Each structure stands twice: as structure tokens, then as C-alpha cells.
Symmetry: D3
């Protein structure tokens, strides 16, 4: 009766238009305003290749533009059919990593790499998409989270982790790589500079409880219940003012993201201003080629 | 023998000139350089209305300008005479909240709102007064700390919380509101970005011990001893160089507050320069209409 | 000639007791005039001056029928005909602990029991944080703390003939290590700002305009007339938008304080929506809120 | 007319564009992207924004393109007026933002569909793309149109017809992001506040004096000079140009800025033998040998 | 058998050229790419005087420039021969502190102070050296860490602390001093603003375990094993890509250090660019006085 | 015509061994002159040049009788009469690991066992952090890293006739991604700074002055004479105030490092007080401190 798999097929439906997905799965909950986005290459611990990043971007972007979706659950499928091992995401697929970055290939191995096509590092675009979308993204760490996979959990708004199977391991420097952006600096804004430097410089494996104690993981859950708890967290988020939740996310981003953070938060303020009679008077005055009349609108202080 | 009330009336005296306070109480300790500032509307869990904010500002401002006061203890009176419930502060009084913010009213309910008078959100001014005053402000959370009340706690330099009665709950998004300034972004600089986002996005109730573990509460105390512990903390603060304590507070504020932070710290540096013979030579040379002589004052490196 | 046109201005009720500052409301416009009134010492401010200045600016901030503040200096000097906006802190009553309250004009009347203050910094923040445009009209010398006040204002207009900018801080052993210096660098760039402070030279209106700290140069007699024209153009726009724009300009430079002020106004904007009103109503009626009428935007 | 048709070719796959034009230079690694609604001073509606994003994104991913020229077509067939871009099309502005419509006017708005403000997405795309974007202001630049020039890396402006006018507060709108705060990092806080608070009209020469316009050119020569600038840019080390742009963005853009600059530093490390040894060791399931690679200081 | 001393004399060799050191010791490990740098005035709890600072800077600078050294262990020798008391570092030597700062003296006490020579506060230069050097610096807190000694610990990349003997006490304000830089503001980026303010404003003594719980100490070790654990941590660090480790340290520093942070990280990016064929084409074209040919080098995105 | 007036300058004791740099102290003023001395390669620096430049600037930093550093280039070139401030890194000894030490002048003599360095960045930080005003006198070409050196100096004066600013970094596949670029933008604004780097055009003294990166333009023969005048005006003010001001200008731009330096100086001011001394004395006398004589200021 105890399931080894967090996924409950009865609770989830495929999303229309996404039959061609190979490296990623995308479900919408049967009742809730919540979607499930998951890595789908468990044979390589859910390592992503450039095509994986493209699918992940497409799917997250679709969720961003779905008005009836409030929360994204980001996770990994499994286990490995080869050894039963569990993974959230093991970062960039090393098999198709070249001197210019991760390269598109016709097959799974290095020999099928299109040598004419320069490599990319555009998981960074997925990071920004997660960061900038006006919806809460909750990472469900159901297994190994290593390299770029570790950095993905870091950039999510919230993280829940499997007690039995979550393993956090920043392996970047082991393979001569490094996430010098959100993966490292933003980790320091969750667990502090000392712990963050330890995690990267020594590359040790941490449990869910250890990461929770340090401040990068919000709560620990039983593996079988990880998505159930995820859905409960999403339900609590979706039960509040969506307008307030949106502003709050951009408020938490703002200063850390400089002018970009201000752009997003100020953008939402501009939308709020557009709803007002005062802004409509401004529009109407222009269209009617007359001076605007601001006298009904007080100078708040 | 066990008091349900943290307040020890024998230890405190009313402050002269504060006759007319209705929403707030203001005491000076009988021996120590410490004052007690408290919300005084326990029947509504110490929610503040614009008049409450005005009294609070005036009282904190007086404490700021009192040379014989080193530490402010900010707390809530209680319990509710209606149900015996304890509160530090439950944020803005929802009864007089309008479309333009919290509105002045002649009575307690929405019907007595002065409709000719625009709403205000100027608890933010109290936040800055606490932030900018050259004295340590310790928040003693003696009960519910919710909404704007939670955010007041966040902005204080230090927080002590009642074991039995403190309950931290960020209810902003529940009533369609949000503190997008110190309430949220500054919380993240105490407990890290993941926990701060959790606290706001889910709006769960946290105990003193839980908040202490996350990093927003300095210590947990027995309810009956909360002000006693507060006074002990104040005494330790007051036993150090007042000049060093002043500079240290502005040093902690500085970068987080940008140019405002620099302004406050540099302002105190200017005062230190004014104490020197070199600065006195500059003033005198101008007043005597002669060139200054800097030769007695060596260059340091 | 004199930039002050007495016919255009009325005294503000409740301010009969002002000694170091004058305060007028325009006869027709949503504009006030705030001016230093010690031209015999080049409009140097003492602590009492600062108190009056703060109180008057605070009153303008809280006047809903006022949109723009014009900050300037009265003159000329009755002693030598010299023109000044403001020459900074009154050096006569500067002590080792800062500028001190005194019953008279000189150090001999200083209240020795009372520590000195530097709370022009409080006026700077009041100017910086108020949800209204403050225009500095530099009608003469602007030196020391007076120079730093023009720097922190949103806009500066300057008298062609008589405006003189001179950062004399380091000459008398002082320094504005806040807005006076760092924020000046965000107007004229780090090289020019360092020059202005390190060498303490005198600059004309036109020179400051070329460097970027002065918005426009006006004829002396027309300085307040041009100020009123600028104020009128500002007052012809959405007050809501002007308010948001000022705080947007402040935001990143002011860190968490900047975010607090801008987000504070964003919160007011949310409070105006039906969605926020449903949040209030549900709490008051002790029922669950119903968010279904309010769509998610992206 | 600044447009020289002989110098430009249409780009394959963009036959369906209606609000925007998109050309590639016949010889140079340079593209031309232009607003194409001159009858309303090149105001953009959400469809314009979608086309603009799609086109700039394509330019970003085109390895044989080094520089983007962003401008407006004209003149107005109605009054001969010249415009770069007048910002959001006010006719279809609603309480929820700019709304999709089947026609040009408010009565054709799809009421079932919420409005958007996603010109901000185009701003970020210009900002984050590893190529220089030069704005050619050939006419009116107002509202969101003014803000689009602000966010471009460089701006060249028509002496006779460029008109800069930040009208945001006139119509109760505001760009509280790059449009204003970033303008201040070009012309300084005093001038930026003046531009927004008063919303006056400025010439090319005035904006050049303030620091927001790199150079003024004769109207007929505006695109010719743009192409000359693009050529000088394309003649340098592309790797260095790329690093330079993100270095300029970095601190102003906080963690996002660091992410972009560090992303390119990561690529540079991937080129090294040391990084390749890291990949090889993992793939071959053996310990890495770092001894051939010395520590630098 | 149980050693009271963390130092294992068999594991360390003196470094050539440092025979003249008096206030500091400097060893290189017999096998590992690791050095040991230690305060050597245990009779005054390893308080530093200006000569100590000069030696410390010299030794750390030499380590910075040693290509075969990857990690610096920074600690204190002991115990005091007077009372057996243990110290990492008790900050500035108060005996030779004057009105212009810490002063050079021929002897140990104030009467041998060179009055003609202005005082200095240049432990700040050692702080920046630790901060900016492209190698991990691990602080081994083997006893008291107080005042400026506490701040040195704060600025190191990692801290390990002796269970039995580590005592953290920020005493600055007790003696009228303050570290308004890394000592305070950077501490806040490790333990959060509330705990950081508490540490300074109250100046209480904290254990290794307490500082670890707050986030300023990475791990607690047995006193006899402190340097053994230090060596184990260094070995894990030294087993990764040295290039990646370097980039990662400056990535963690970057935003916190503004333009200085950008300068250091960008400098390393420039070195990486110099390794490329493209950069070499740039150099060669200039030297051969011909136009560069960039056509072999793809634009990446 | 030469800007250098030999009569005004004396060699500094202990610096006889300098080869790539010259170092003089003024015969009367608290001012030194530090100059690149390889005019045959447009004053391009090699690693040895950087070491000498650091040592000389460090010595000036620690000299209590020196207030101002004038940083410039010697010339003209004995080969073609060309004038240079500094053309950046010596490309002849640039390798894949950076600029390399060599026994001779050319690439064939580089020590292959010794990795390259980019440590002109250390000189930039030394200029940036030293508590004294550094004025760059651009007497000729300023290119690459040489351009970045002027950018990081506090003030820049430039020769009308011979100053030439040209950011050639991207021409040779290099880039200054720190103070050279990002800090230039805080002088001339983001548009002009991007223009300067992306196109790498040559600009005159007058053009750079208009953009905001050059404080003043001077006649070539008078460049050091004007430099000495600027230094004299700087040296006539409170040294303590000038010091605080420089770190105040640095502060926010330099994050925790900026704060560290400014607060460090504030700590020194505090050490001068009776209050700080009571703290010391109480510790030394093993007694509680008595803070009662020292008032709380606000
Ligand atoms: C360039 C002038 C403005 C005009 O000179 P002029 O030749 O035209 O007239 P002058 O003879 O100097 O002045 C006329 C009368 O006014 C007096 N006076 C002018 N300014 C002041 C003044 N600030 N304080 C006291 N008296 C002043 C003069 O002494 C003189 O008095 P009289 O001989 O008729 O008896 C010149 O007077 C002057 O340099 N005055 C001093 C400017 C000054 O150093 N102000 C204060 C420096 S510091 C500062 O303002 C300040 C304040 C608060 C701060 C807070 C935080 C951080 C920094 C702060 C700060 O830097
Ligand atoms: C200064 C002009 C550009 C030139 O005036 P001119 O006197 O030469 O010609 P005019 O007769 O006014 O315009 C010619 C035709 O084009 C129309 N037109 C011009 N601009 C627009 C326009 N923006 N929207 C709709 N129609 C426009 C005019 O109504 C007119 O139509 P007609 O009566 O001949 O049939 C003037 O047209 C004008 O003020 N246009 C409006 C400028 C404007 O306020 N744009 C919107 C500001 S708000 C905005 O762009 C925007 C968008 C997204 C944002 C996202 C986040 C944050 C902020 C945002 C934002 O602020
Ligand atoms: C907590 C202790 C470290 C341990 O106390 P314990 O109870 O174990 O034994 P104790 O009797 O106090 O010390 C044993 C011997 O060591 C001496 N000693 C300990 N620390 C110092 C010390 N720092 N300076 C001079 N002597 C010291 C003691 O006086 C005593 O001497 P003895 O009576 O045998 O002759 C305690 O000694 C103590 O508080 N020491 C002072 C800590 C302190 O306040 N240091 C200076 C704060 S300021 C700071 O370090 C500093 C320095 C440079 C800075 C530069 C720029 C900006 C900031 C700076 C800065 O903040
Ligand atoms: C614009 C000139 C300065 C003047 O041109 P002109 O036509 O007047 O004279 P020219 O014939 O080019 O030069 C005269 C002699 O001096 C030589 N020369 C001039 N500059 C250099 C030079 N920098 N290195 C080596 N030789 C140089 C010339 O090769 C030539 O040698 P000759 O033919 O007599 O044997 C031109 O010479 C020139 O562009 N020189 C190279 C400028 C350059 O690209 N420098 C390196 C950019 S990168 C850089 O400096 C640098 C260094 C360290 C960094 C560290 C961290 C981050 C960034 C860094 C960085 O960007």
C-alpha cells in the first residue's frame, strides 16, 4: 500500500496541445488551479539537454499565460527504470556538453551532436521565467538535486523535499562548471553566506532536514505524500487574494533584481493604476482632444 | 501568584504631557533609561486606526528626543476584556479601511468615517521612525502579531516573544492587502527568502519558537517575564558606549537603505568630525574672515 | 529687481509666529512658496530655522489642495545687497556637538545644557519622501548645506545673474556625506561631483546647467514666475502618476526605504480595487472571501 | 525618407507581419526592425508587441546578425507627420491594460480577454540580448515609445523630426521601470525628473546635450549613419562586445545582471581544457586530474 | 592521550623566508596544498597590534601568490602560558590604542609607544585581502573570538569552531569601538539582521553550537580535532576544479561588494577570454598591424 | 611645449631603481607626480610597470606630507614624437594567461614557467581606496587599460591639443568589465559609456569634457601647471573632510567595501573622543566603564 511514487495519476490530466512532449511532462490538476511540470529523463537522473530546456520553457510559459492556474509544482519523474534511483534533476546532460555549452543532438549521445550548431546555457532563461512569472513556483525535490538541478530548486519561490529520497548536492565545481548567478548568490540569500559557500566549495550531499535547518527547504514531507503536501500548499496559496500574491512575489524579488525587479513590480503597479477612474480620465481626455480634469482625484499623502 | 499579565505597574511611571493618549500607553521605567510604548486597543486585538498611528508616532518621537532614554520597548496591552485574548497588534483597523486606505473617524465604526478626508497608510512613517531613530527598539510580542502588526515586529531592531501567547501570522493577502516594503523584503533579510515567501504566501500561524528557529525572533520568554526579560535586554544595551551603539545601528541599516542609510550614518560621522579641533579651526577661520591653518592636523591613512 | 511678486501670494493661516522662514500660498494656483528669511547672513539656517522649515514643508505635504512646493530664499541683504538662496548651517552657533539652539543670534546665547543637532538631514528626507514635486529656486548664493538642499530637491531653477553655487563644506571642516555628495554624483556624474566638493569653486547657473544639476536658467526678476509656470505644468498632470513617478525615481537609490515608499503607494492602488474591498468585507462579515470574480493578470 | 529600399531584404518566414516590418541588410550583419502604424504615430497595440517580440527574438537567435536597428516607418499618409513610436494605442486601452481587438477601435475589443502591459517583455528582451540594439528616432517618441528608446543600448536621432516627449503622466500612465529610473542613469536625476514631471517636447540636439541621444543625424541620413555605427560595432571582437554589454547591465540589474554576465563567464570556462577534463572524468567514471591546470592570481 | 592542543607539529613545515616572524606563525602542510596562519600572542588572548597586522598581511599575501596553495587555515596559537586560556583572537591590543588608533610601540605597553607616529586601523586591509584573494580562507576558532577577532572570523569564507573552547563575543561597544563594515553588516548576511543586531547590541558570549545554529559557523569540531577537520575541509575544496572554485568565490562576493565585486569577478572573466583563440587573434592583429579577422568566431546566445 | 617643468620637481628618496615609472615630489607643495615612462610604446604597461606603479602609489598613500597625486605619462615618444598618457597593457607580452613577466621587451623573452597576471586591477583599487585625491593628467593617448586608469581616478584634466581618448579593448579582444566600463557610465551616463566602448572611436579632451568624463581642458604646456593649481585648492581644505568626502563618494557604488572604508574612517573619528578613551581605560583598569559624562545625541 505504501507507494514508492509521489505521483497520483487519478488527480492529474494532460494539457491540450502538448502531445509532442518527450523530455518533460505537464499535467493540470482535476480540481485545483495547479499544474505539475516534471523532468522526464529518469534514466540519467533527469539531466536536461537543450531540447529539455526548450520544452520546460514552453510549458512554464503556457502555465504563466493560463488565467485559471495559480501555482506551478516543479518536480522530477521516476524512478530510473534501470536501478530504481530517484532524481529531481541532475543538471546539464554532460554527454552533450561541449566547449561552447550544451549542444543540440539528434540522439542521446555525443556522437550525434550537430557540430555546426553552437552550444547554449539557456536553462538561465528558464530561471528568469520562473523568477519573473506572477505565480508561485514550488519545487518538489523528490530525489537528487545536483548541479543545475540544485540551482533550479534554489530559484523557485518555495521548496518541499522528500524525507527519504531528497539529496542536495552542488556538484558544479566537480565537473569544472559553476552557476555564478541565482544558483550561488541567491542561495546565500536563503541560507546565509557561510552555508552557501560551504555547499558550493565542498559539494557535500545534504538531506532534506539539513537543508531545511539551513533555510533553503521550507518543509520536509514523506516521499509518498510529497505531491499531496505540494497540492495542500498550493491550495493555501490559491485561497488568498491573487492580486496580493502577485504583488508580494514581485516585492520579494525587487531589490535583489535591481532595475529588473523594479520594472516587474512597477509594471504591476501601472496595471493597478490603469483600473482607476483617474487613469481612465487620462485616456478619455487624450481621445477627446481636451484637457484632462483631475479635480475629482485627491492628492493622497 | 503566576501573573497572566507581563505588565508590572510598580516598575513604570506615566510620562508628563501625555494626558490625552487614548489608543496608546507611554511609560518611563522608574530606574532605567527605558520606556514602554504599547498599543491600547485590546478589544480589537490592538488594531491601529489613523489616530493610533498619530499617537504612536508622537510618543516614539518624544522617546527619540529624550536624552535620558536609551531603549524603547514596543508592545501591546491586554488582554481583551471581551474574551481574555492576547495581542501585540493585529494591523490596520479593518472597520475604517476604505478604498484610499485607513480613514479617520469620530467613532469606532465605518459609519462615522469623515468622508471628506482621504485615507492614509502612514504606519509606514512609524516604520521609518523606528528604523531611523538612533536608539534600539525592542519589540515584545505578547500575543497575536498579524498583518501590519507582524510588519511592525519585523522592522524593530530586536524581538522577544511570549512562549504561551505569541502567534505570528501574516494575514495581508487574506484581506487583499500587502506590505511590499519592510514587512516582506526586510523579513527576507532575517529569515532568508524561502521562509519569508512562505510566511506571506501561505499565511500560517507560527509559534515564538518557530519564528526563533527561522531567525525573526531573538529569544522566547515566559509570558509573565516578557517585560522583565525585555528590561534585562535593555539594561545590557544601556551598559555599552551610547556613541558606539548609535553608529552600529546605522551601520546595520546602511546598505539595505541605500542613500537614506548612508545619509543617517554619514550624518553621525559629521557630528564626530565637529568634535575635533580641526573642524573648530574651520569654523573659526570663516567667522574671523581669515584663511584656515591646517598644519597642526596630520593626515591619517 | 525682486523675484517676489507680493500680489501673487497670501500668507498661510496658523503661521503668524514664523521668524526665520516665510510661507505663502499662491492666490490661484495649487502651489506654495517656502523661503529662508535671514538674508543678513546669506540665509544661513539655525536649529530654529530648521524646525520652522520642517513644520512648513510638513504642512504643505499634508495640504490636499497643494501640488507643488517652491523652495527659495528671500533677499536681498539689507546690509550689502547680497543675494542668497541659503548658505548652509549658521556657523555662529555651530558647536562641537553640532548646531545649537540659542536665545539670540550668537554663541554667547547658546543653551549649554542642550546638545547640538544636524537635523537639516530630517528636512532633506521630508523633501525626498513627500509625494509632491519640490522645486528649488536658487536666487543667489547656495553654499554648504544650502547647496545640499538644492541637490535633494526634485528640480532646480536658477537666477542667471545672481545664482552662485559653491560647495564650501570642506573649507570649514564639514561634509555632507549623504545626499549632498553621493546624490549630486547621480545628477552630474562622479567626476564633476567630486570636483564640486574637493575644490569648492563657485559656479554660475549656466555652468551647473551644463553639468546637469540645474534644470533651467531664468532671469532674476522672472525666477519665481518661471517657477510658477513649471509648477502649473506639473499640476496639469495626473497627481496619481506624478506621485508614483517620484517614488520610482527615488526607489533603487534609496534601497528598502525607496521600496517602502513606492510599494506603499502600490498598496493604496490595490485598496481601490473591488478585490481588496472583498478582502475587507469578508473579514468584517466573518466569512470566507470569494475571489472568483477577480481574474489573474499576466 | 531615411529608408533605402535597395539596401534591405525581407526576412524569410515573416510574410504575415502587419504592425511591424523586419529586414536584413543585403551585405551587413545588421537588421532593421520598424513600427508600421504611421497613421497613429506608430502606436503599438498588443498584436504589435507580439510581432515586435517575435522579430527581436528571431534577430537574437540569428548567428549572422550582430546589430539591431530599431525605428519607425513613415510618414503618416494622413498628415505627413513623422514618428518613431507614440507608445500604447490609447483606443484599445482598458481598465485591465491594452486589449486585443479584431479592428483598430474600441468597439472591436475582445471583452472576454484581459488586457496586457507586455511591452515590458520587449524591454527585457532588448536589455538581455547579447547584441547591440540601436534606436533610430526618426520622429515623435512619446510614452512607451520614449521608454523603448531609453532601454536601447544606443540612440541616433533625426535633427529635423525627432521629438522626445514623455506624455505618461498626461494620460495617467507611468513607466516606473526602465523608462524613468534608467533614464536617470543616462541624463542624471534632475533632467530625468524634468522630462517626466513636465512632459515637454525636446529636440534631438537637446536630448543629446542631456545625454540620452548619442548623435544627431540629418533625417535622410539617419539609417545610413545607423548602418555605419552598426559596422563599427560589428568590426570588433563579438566575444568582447557581448561581455561588455552585460558588464554595463550588471549592477543596475542586480541578480539578473549577475546571472547574465556570469552565464557568459561560465561559457568561457567551458571552453577550457580544465572544464573538458571535468566533463570527461564524469563521463568516464573516474576522478578528475586537475594537476595540469595551474592556479592563477 | 587526549591533546589539549589542535596543532599537530608533525603535519606542518615552516615556510622559507619567514624566520623573522614574531606575532604570527606560518606553516605549509607537509603533503597538502594548505597553509596554516596563526596569531601568536596567546598571553593577551592573541590581540593584534600594528606589527601583528603587518605580519599577517605579509603572510596572507604570500599565500595568495603561492601557486601550490589552495586553502588558508586561519587560527590562533595557545594556550596562554599564564593561565592556560584559549583564544583565536581578541581584536586590537587595547594597551597601545590611542586617540588616532592602534600605535606602533617598541615594547608591549603604552609607555613605549612612538608618539610621533599616527595610529592606524589597518586590520581593515587584512579583511579586504582575505575577501579578495582567489582562494578559500577557513577560520578555525579555537578559543575566544572577540572584537576585531570576531570580525576576522566573520569575513572568512568558512568557519569551523572548537566545541569546548570557542567563545564568540562581540565586545566592540563595551570599549567604545565599532566595526561598521564587514564585522557587522556582513555578519547580517550570515545570520540575518535580528541575530546580527543582537550579537553587537548586547555583546553576549555565544558557544560554537549557538553560532552554528544562527548560521555564522559552518561546523563544530572537537578541540583536539579542529585542525584535522580543517585539513579535511581544505582537501575537499582542493579536490575540485581550481578555476571553478575561484570564479565561485568572486560570484558570492560580487553584488555585496558593488563595483569592487564586479571588478574582481569581471577580471577573472577577462582572463578566461584571454585564453581563447579569438583574443589571441586580437593581440596578433595589433602586433602585425593588420585588421583582425573575427569570421571564425561565432556569436553565441 | 613639454608639460613637465623639471625645476618644480625632485626625485623621491629610495626610488633610484625605477625603470618604467617616474616619481617626483613637488619642491614646495604637498603633491607628487607619478608618470608612465615608456613613451616609445605609448606608455603601455607590462607587469613590472604595474609593480612599480603600485609601490610608488602605495608610498604616496603612506606619506603624511602628501595630499594629492598627479598621475600622467612622460613623453613625447623619441621615435615619432607621439604623446601618450597610457595605451594600456603591453600587447607584446600578453599571453593566453594574461600579461607576462619577461627578461626583455618582446614576446620571445617571456618566462614560460610564470603565469600571466591582470593586476592593473590592484592599482585601480589602490587609487580607488587611498584616502587622497588622485588627479589624472591626460597628456596624450589614453587607450585600453590606460583609458580605464583615467576613469577610476577622482578627477581628470586633459591636454586640449594632444589628449586622445580611445577605448580599444574590443578591438584586441579584451574588455574591462569593472571600473573601466560600469564606472564610466556613472560619469557620462549609460548611453555615452556604451558608445565609447562599443564603437571605440577617438575623442578629444573637449568632447570627453562635454560628456562628463573630463573635468577641465588645459593647454598642453600648462597641463601640469593647472594640475598643481587644482592640487593646491584641494590641499587648502580640511584634510579630514576631504578624506571623508572621497569615501562618501565611493560608498554605495562599492557596496560592503565602500561601507568598510567609510565606516573605518568614522571609527577613527570615534577613537578621538573622550568616550572611546573611557572604553579603553576601563578595560585596561579592569573596571566597569562610566558612560554618564557622555550625552546621547539625536
Ligand atoms: C560664499 C558665501 C555664501 C557668500 O560670501 P560673500 O562674500 O558673498 O558674503 P559674506 O561676507 O561671506 O557673508 C555676509 C554675512 O553673512 C555671514 N554669513 C554668511 N554665511 C554664513 C553662515 N553659513 N553662517 C554664519 N554666518 C554666515 C557672514 O559672516 C557675513 O556676516 P557679517 O560680516 O556681515 O557680520 C560665504 O558667505 C560663505 O562661504 N558662507 C559660509 C558657507 C558655509 O560654510 N556654510 C556652512 C558649511 S556646512 C553646512 O552648511 C551643513 C549644514 C548641515 C549639515 C548636516 C549634515 C551634513 C552636513 C551638513 C552641512 O555640511
Ligand atoms: C505627441 C504626439 C505623439 C504627437 O502629437 P501630434 O500633434 O503631432 O499628432 P496627433 O494629431 O496628436 O496624432 C496624429 C494621430 O495619431 C493619433 N495618435 C497619436 N498617438 C496615439 C496613441 N499613443 N494612441 C492612439 N492614437 C494616437 C492621434 O489620436 C491622431 O489621430 P487622428 O485624430 O488624426 O485620427 C501625440 O500624438 C501624443 O501625445 N500621442 C500619445 C502619446 C501617449 O500618451 N502614448 C501613451 C502613453 S502611455 C504608454 O505608452 C505605455 C504603454 C505600456 C506601458 C507599460 C508599462 C508601464 C507604462 C506603459 C506606458 O506608459
Ligand atoms: C573576552 C576576552 C577576550 C577574554 O577574557 P578572559 O576572561 O578569558 O581573560 P582576560 O583576563 O580578560 O585576558 C587575559 C589577558 O589577556 C589581556 N587581553 C585580552 N584581550 C586583550 C586585548 N584586546 N588587548 C589587550 N589586552 C588583552 C587581558 O588584559 C589579560 O591581561 P593580564 O591581566 O594577564 O595582564 C577579554 O579579554 C576581552 O574582552 N578582551 C577585549 C576584547 C576587545 O574589546 N578588543 C578590542 C575591541 S576593538 C577591535 O578589536 C578592533 C581592532 C581594530 C579595528 C580596526 C578598524 C575598525 C575596527 C577595529 C576594531 O573594532
Ligand atoms: C591608439 C594608440 C594608443 C596610438 O596609435 P598611434 O598611431 O598613435 O601609434 P602606434 O604606431 O600604434 O604606436 C607606436 C608604437 O608603440 C606600440 N604600442 C602602442 N601601444 C601599445 C601597446 N598597448 N602594447 C604594445 N605596444 C604598443 C606600437 O605597436 C608602436 O610600436 P612600433 O611600430 O614603433 O614598434 C595605438 O597605439 C593603440 O591602439 N595601442 C594599443 C591600445 C590597446 O588596445 N591596449 C590594450 C587594450 S586591453 C588593456 O589595456 C588591459 C590591460 C589590463 C587589463 C586588466 C583587467 C581588465 C582589462 C585589462 C585591459 O583591458
Amino acid at each position: 500500500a505504501l507507494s514508492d511514487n509521489p505521483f497520483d495519476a487519478k488527480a492529474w490530466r494532460l494539457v491540450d496541445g502538448f502531445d509532442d512532449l518527450t523530455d518533460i511532462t505537464y499535467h493540470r490538476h482535476v480540481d485545483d488551479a495547479t499544474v505539475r511540470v516534471a523532468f522526464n529523463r529518469p534514466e540519467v537522473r533527469n539531466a536536461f539537454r537543450p531540447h529539455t530546456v526548450d520544452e520546460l520553457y514552453r510549458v512554464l510559459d503556457h502555465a504563466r499565460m493560463s488565467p485559471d492556474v495559480g501555482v506551478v509544482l516543479l518536480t522530477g519523474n521516476g524512478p530510473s527504470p534501470k536501478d530504481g534511483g530517484w532524481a529531481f534533476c541532475s543538471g546539464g546532460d554532460q554527454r552533450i556538453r561541449g566547449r561552447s555549452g550544451y549542444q543540440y543532438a539528434s540522439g542521446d549521445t555525443a556522437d550525434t551532436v550537430d557540430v555546426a550548431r553552437a552550444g547554449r546555457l539557456h536553462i538561465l532563461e528558464v530561471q528568469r521565467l520562473i523568477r519573473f512569472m506572477p505565480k508561485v513556483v514550488i519545487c518538489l525535490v523528490n530525489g537528487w538535486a545536483a548541479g543545475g538541478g540544485h540551482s533550479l530548486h534554489v530559484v523557485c519561490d518555495l521548496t518541499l523535499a522528500s524525507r527519504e529520497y531528497a539529496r542536495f548536492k552542488q556538484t558544479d565545481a566537480d565537473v569544472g562548471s559553476f552557476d555564478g548567478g541565482y544558483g550561488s548568490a541567491y542561495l546565500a540569500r536563503q541560507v546565509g553566506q557561510k552555508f552557501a559557500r560551504e555547499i558550493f566549495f565542498l559539494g557535500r550531499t545534504y538531506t532534506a532536514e539539513q537543508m531545511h535547518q539551513m533555510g533553503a527547504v521550507n518543509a520536509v514531507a514523506e516521499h509518498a505524500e510529497l505531491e499531496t503536501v505540494g497540492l495542500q500548499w498550493a491550495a493555501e496559496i490559491n485561497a488568498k487574494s491573487p492580486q496580493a500574491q502577485r504583488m508580494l512575489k514581485f516585492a520579494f524579488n525587487l531589490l535583489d533584481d535591481g532595475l529588473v525587479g523594479q520594472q516587474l513590480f512597477a509594471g504591476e503597479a501601472t496595471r493597478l493604476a490603469y483600473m482607476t477612474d483617474e487613469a481612465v480620465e487620462g485616456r478619455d481626455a487624450f481621445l477627446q482632444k481636451r484637457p484632462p480634469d483631475w479635480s475629482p482625484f485627491p492628492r493622497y499623502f
